[PDB]
Design a protein around this ligand. Sequence first.
Ligand code: GTP
Ligand code: GTP
Ligand code: GDP
Ligand code: GDP
Ligand code: MG
Ligand code: MG
Lengths: 432, 432, 430, 430
Amino acid sequence: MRECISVHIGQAGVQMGNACWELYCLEHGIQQDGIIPDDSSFGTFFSETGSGKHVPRAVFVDLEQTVIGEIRTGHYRSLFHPEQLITGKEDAANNYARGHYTIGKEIVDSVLDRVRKMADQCSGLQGFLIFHSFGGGTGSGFTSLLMERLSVDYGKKSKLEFSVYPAPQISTAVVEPYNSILTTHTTLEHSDCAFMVDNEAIYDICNRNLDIERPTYTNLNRLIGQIVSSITASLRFDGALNVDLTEFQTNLVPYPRIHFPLVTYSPIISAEKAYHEQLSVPEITNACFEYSNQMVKCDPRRGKYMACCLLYRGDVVPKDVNAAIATIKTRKSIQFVDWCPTGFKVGINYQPPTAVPGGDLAKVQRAVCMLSNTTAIAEAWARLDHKFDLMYSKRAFVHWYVGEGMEEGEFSEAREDMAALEKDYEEVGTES
Amino acid sequence: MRECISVHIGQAGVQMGNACWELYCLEHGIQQDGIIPDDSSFGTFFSETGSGKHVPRAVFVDLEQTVIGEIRTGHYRSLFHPEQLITGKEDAANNYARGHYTIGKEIVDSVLDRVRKMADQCSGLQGFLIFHSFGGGTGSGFTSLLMERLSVDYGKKSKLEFSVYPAPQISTAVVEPYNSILTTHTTLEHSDCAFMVDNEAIYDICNRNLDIERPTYTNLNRLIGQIVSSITASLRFDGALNVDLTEFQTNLVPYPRIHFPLVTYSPIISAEKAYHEQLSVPEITNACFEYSNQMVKCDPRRGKYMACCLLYRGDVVPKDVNAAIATIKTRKSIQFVDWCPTGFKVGINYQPPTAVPGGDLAKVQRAVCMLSNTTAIAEAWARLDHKFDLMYSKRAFVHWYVGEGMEEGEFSEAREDMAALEKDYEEVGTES
Amino acid sequence: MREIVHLQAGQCGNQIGAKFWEVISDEHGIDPTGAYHGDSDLQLERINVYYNEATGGKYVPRAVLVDLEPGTMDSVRSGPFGQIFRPDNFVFGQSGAGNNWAKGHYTEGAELVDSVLDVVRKEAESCDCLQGFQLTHSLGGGTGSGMGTLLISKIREEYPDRIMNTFSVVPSPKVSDTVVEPYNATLSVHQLVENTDETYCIDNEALYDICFRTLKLTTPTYGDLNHLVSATMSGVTTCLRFPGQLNADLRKLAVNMVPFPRLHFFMPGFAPLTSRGSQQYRALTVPELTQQMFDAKNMMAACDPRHGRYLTVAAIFRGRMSMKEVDEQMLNVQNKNSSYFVEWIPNNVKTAVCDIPPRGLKMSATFIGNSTAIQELFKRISEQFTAMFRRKAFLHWYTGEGMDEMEFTEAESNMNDLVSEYQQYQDATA
Amino acid sequence: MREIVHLQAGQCGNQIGAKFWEVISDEHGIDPTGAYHGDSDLQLERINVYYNEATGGKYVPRAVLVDLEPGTMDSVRSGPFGQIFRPDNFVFGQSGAGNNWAKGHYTEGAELVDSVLDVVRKEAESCDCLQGFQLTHSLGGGTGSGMGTLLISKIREEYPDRIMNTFSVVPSPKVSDTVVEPYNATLSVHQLVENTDETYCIDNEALYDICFRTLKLTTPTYGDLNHLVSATMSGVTTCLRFPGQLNADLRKLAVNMVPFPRLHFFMPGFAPLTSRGSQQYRALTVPELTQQMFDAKNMMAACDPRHGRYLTVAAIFRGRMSMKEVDEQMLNVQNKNSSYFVEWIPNNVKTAVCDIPPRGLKMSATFIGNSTAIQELFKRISEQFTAMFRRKAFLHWYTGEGMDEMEFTEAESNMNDLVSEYQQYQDATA
Ligand SMILES: Nc1nc2c(ncn2[C@@H]2O[C@H](COP(=O)(O)OP(=O)(O)OP(=O)(O)O)[C@@H](O)[C@H]2O)c(=O)[nH]1
Ligand SMILES: Nc1nc2c(ncn2[C@@H]2O[C@H](COP(=O)(O)OP(=O)(O)OP(=O)(O)O)[C@@H](O)[C@H]2O)c(=O)[nH]1
Ligand SMILES: Nc1nc2c(ncn2[C@@H]2O[C@H](COP(=O)(O)OP(=O)(O)O)[C@@H](O)[C@H]2O)c(=O)[nH]1
Ligand SMILES: Nc1nc2c(ncn2[C@@H]2O[C@H](COP(=O)(O)OP(=O)(O)O)[C@@H](O)[C@H]2O)c(=O)[nH]1
Ligand SMILES: [Mg+2]
Ligand SMILES: [Mg+2]
């Protein structure tokens, strides 16, 4: 009945998607193909055919064709519908203009059609899940191009996006500040709720809590795979207090332009050191509010919380959830904004998280995913805007962007909009 | 009881006929000969003899004798009656005048006699199926000569013709605009309904949907073979809501001079990518209205529909057909002309389409053939008339036509008639 | 059916023809003794297009060999595939033409033309359905230029409706092989423009380039050049002899290639052509064949198409191919070079695809192009002709054989008009 | 898709290129005969980036070899992996350039450039999606400096949007190998700064140090130096040919490495480089590879980065590695050497990680650094150029070939401006 269309943009989204759909297939008994061996709630993500083959309800789009070409040769070659996997001629080359104005224009009409063929095949449309990179290229331009196209064809339908936000210190591209601001300016008015994660933050978690000194990108993706499973577990499984994707919009977004929650997942524990842990509900709930466990390298205590969604899983008792949240509300260090006395949205599900073979997480009994909107993220935007200001003041790389469909003015408009958003975060955080 | 006389003119018709009669023999258990191995509805196309030999009710006529000479040496050498295969001395040499005035006059009295020997052998005559090329030669002159002869000997009997309409960009002859207009001028008043197909349009379909980069003419013909089987499936097989060849005339032709429907066939899908498709009735019905699946390279949305015939096959439920058409009627992009509130003629048949061994189409369960009359085809006529106007203004190739039985005036009369028809299409498309 | 009768002339025609009949006999399995030993039966089905049958499986070409000197044919009959021809078809005189058009046309060939016609009519009347006449000659010689055009006029007056196609070797611009070429060419062309349907202009200098550049041949004899001419002559008459996805009869080409009556001069081509060492570096597919077909370096005529515009074009493919590729390539060529194609012709390409390729090749193609750039050839000859004619350079050799100076002026005027007409239709609409 | 077409020039380019195609063919399993015998199928998936296919599994490099003298290529085709190249791609003249830029650019190469373009266009048009052109030459010679820059201008005018990357050997400061180097370098650079996207400056003296110091090689031939240049040229084009955790296209590097249009001169590097006896004393892990990548002693350009600041940097890793290590090391380098990185660029490192390493190595890395210290190289050449030019040291050899003294002044002014621009952006904000 319910449905979720997954759009995976760029190398990040495509590689994150590989982990998501390896988990979903495992959460439903699927056999790396559309086949199920000789397992009934899959309908939210998997379309079914008379052959016994289940087809993921996802669209893989990339202007580059090396990452997707690896899927077609991978173990999941025979899972996805071949026309879902869309590849272009030449990548965006870390340039927002190429992704949005020159190359995106030649693929957007193709991905949008395949989305259409999926939207009309659903008994009822619930929302879109967008996976993309914030660093730039396809993830910055194509997404903002696609987001604007979905906003008109589908209007009020929910649009949730999972963004790999740039890390404070770590960086892999030189023009991230240009791409980060340009995409944000064109996605504020077309996105409902953007869940942020940082590679650096997960890198800390992967060694600080999981005992691994050599995290690859596969490890980070498998951690992100768990989060999305938890977010969509209510649709996929039964529970005591369920939550729907359209509930996040109102619960977490007090104002239309402030829709950037952080992310967390408490029981990120090594298998060996799990033998010495009780892993009770009150303790994991407290771990969510520690700076040491955030998946975005932004310290919550530098700001004030504005909304929180606690999505429990597995063996959980709602009485314990009530107690743990009550104590957390008591702590003075954990500060909520005054104009939000009602601070928590709670969701409980009966399905324990499943562990991917060859993975790193322990076989936990119960888990909680926390989605918190905080004013602390205002610091990250200010830091990002400073980096953009340094480069733009010198016109460090402008000639690349101006010469591929964009214009000089858009740099000024994008930055001032980010200034307004940073101002808005300040007004929200002050009272009387 | 029912009957259909198939006349195949020129190289196109003869080669298209080779595919049609390879399909019919397969649709009836025939064994590449008139024999049926140790299968009862064939009577519509096959005459029967006491020897157990079934004789196709078709006439192959060509002024050239290389294509037909290949049939006599082919696998179906012992299928057709030797006097059905009529060959001439010298071809028409891409000249309409030769086919209509000089060489046709020496064969028309021979093909018409064999038609007579078939018309009187039928328990009841239903109509004629004409296969020919629009590019020129025999297909342009001989057909218009034959069409006028059938119009008098048989009067009101239905005359359906399948034309290989010239493509917009692709071309194989230099004088197509001369032949296309000349034959059209002499076939408007003698033809009931002309189904159009373009080589370019099927070329797009054969690689865009069937995964083949090397379509030969055999591939295109096998696609056209399916269409004619669907059109005549009601006569050949049982169904829930049957349709007869005489019904197309009234359902699709609002006005006597506007009888040029397009053609479509939805489930044109590769065998491998069919495993990832549900192929339900609503989706295939929607595919018929996409420009990406038309068998004529004319965009329907550039104009307004005027009539549509949906001929379903195989496992189809009339309730689903009702729903799918209802939704399509709802879509605003799919625009029907105002003066035709009743837009659809529907036909349902229980026989699933059969796949030719060595073919490219998948073993589909249900299929739909759509025959739509649209004002968009007015653009094609205007484009064709422009090409004729350029050549004729210079008298580029006139000397060939004038010197072989034709006259200078006929060029002017033919073109002005096409101008009137283009004007007529405009009047029909406007209201109040 | 649709029989073709082959006429020779001069030393050039007889040498080219002897090679053409060796190639044709090769693709039909005909031994030099006349017996048939082919493998595929298809090559035998339409063998009547060129050959007549006899007892014991002997096949006799429908060829007429004529020259004013017997030295050339005595070489033909003595060489390989020379005993194939019917002895009665060797029609010849004793005193040759001294490379002067007047002698071959008015004096020497005039008294011998009747002997040839008596063989032509006998050959033609044996055809179930006569398609046309095929003449091979040279415009720079005396027999071919003079007698060949005399035959053309005689046959055209006797078979007005049949198609007559000439494969004429044209004098090269770089170097000549006969001092009186401008007189022979101008006078011969004065006849061709009125009494033939499609002339395939070729020149040796261009074939020298092809052997030197493409084939990388270091010892190109006239046998190598004649093989190139043979291949194109075989190409344009393959639909008559073999089946294909799309056929093209000789009249089919003439209709599509000749917009106006007098613009019937074509410059042929062929592909693939590769050296023995460069064969392992080629894909041998439709996209590249179409690429070198339109390459000005691969055409058998001196005139470069880049200097003018294509009125029309034909591409007779051979071998089993994807029809989709063929149409896409022709359209691709049309789009890129839109400046090279005349604009008042919406489509400038006529396509055909035969199913059987030449022996030893999986694929092949023959290019035929009617281009306004051919006006350079005739204009160049006009400049040479008027130079010599301005001061009676060699007239006495011509006027003494029966000609008159008026005919010289008429021939030049007609050639200039044709050059004007080719130039006129090189300009766009209005 | 994303095909690269390789252009040679002079003796330097032809010698470097011959080694590059031996290395590339090694990692793709291509035998010297052209057949493929690789084990992993991944090396065959993207083989179209450099190679064209033919019948029988033969793969033909998309390479154009050009020189004004055939002695060099005759060595190329006679040596190993020389028969691989398509014979038609060897475009050459007879009279070489006397190490003077004027002859190669205006007089000798001018009449031969058209022959090369006709091969370049034919090669380029066969690409499904053309990524860019790759040119190997030398700025100190006559063919490479003169003709190579002439080709660059011609291609840039014909393919404006495509990326053009040059791997140019730069004259060394210590000792010269051509008396007129300042004229060839200055004139060649005057063209590069306007008509190329990313130039990889290298000099032999630096590679001599690497062989002497790091590899401890006692008999370093030019084959050893060219192998070093080959490895870096293979490194920057591995993402196009193999998958990885994080890809970097040629345009991906140019965007991240070229802040301003004219500052597109890079000094490459490579790692690991160890002697045969010192291999058993190394861990061979990411932390040390990143350590010697930024070591000034391991860079293939004379200019030392310590004398200036890095505008940007790229680190194209190869082999399966921990992404955490890579980012931590790049950040670690960034923190320690914060004085060496320009401050108005918040992040000065572009990272990439290919999954497949070079044959025989578990890990590898290619360093590309755009540094203001490169201004030393051009300033040094300016000092030599102005010294000779001050008293017409050798002009008559240049002005006699068609050049003019004004062009000499313009070239020097342009080079001085570029040196000024590099110096200007070496200062912090305000
Ligand atoms: N978590 C995670 N992040 C990734 C992964 N791959 C790339 N990224 C992030 O993506 C950011 C840059 O955007 P990319 O995805 O690499 O570029 P793109 O979206 O493909 O757009 P183009 O530049 O046109 O290729 C980097 O800073 C990485 O942090 C991955 O596998 N997992
Ligand atoms: N679909 C399809 N079309 C064909 C086929 N063969 C020829 N045609 C079309 O026929 C058009 C030209 O008319 P032809 O059939 O070739 O000529 P004709 O009818 O034999 O008349 P003549 O010129 O006298 O030979 C071309 O433009 C082709 O598109 C075929 O096998 N399949
Ligand atoms: N390709 C080719 N050309 C020839 C041959 N013989 C003569 N020619 C050409 O014919 C011209 C000479 O005229 P020729 O035919 O010998 O005089 P004719 O005998 O009176 O017709 C010159 O331009 C020659 O290049 C030949 O065997 N092969
Ligand atoms: N690494 C390397 N450098 C070379 C080679 N051949 C020449 N060079 C360099 O090229 C410069 C000489 O110019 P050269 O290319 O020979 O002149 P050209 O043939 O006209 O381009 C000198 O600085 C040499 O150091 C070679 O095989 N390998
Ligand atoms: Mg990418
Ligand atoms: Mg025909």
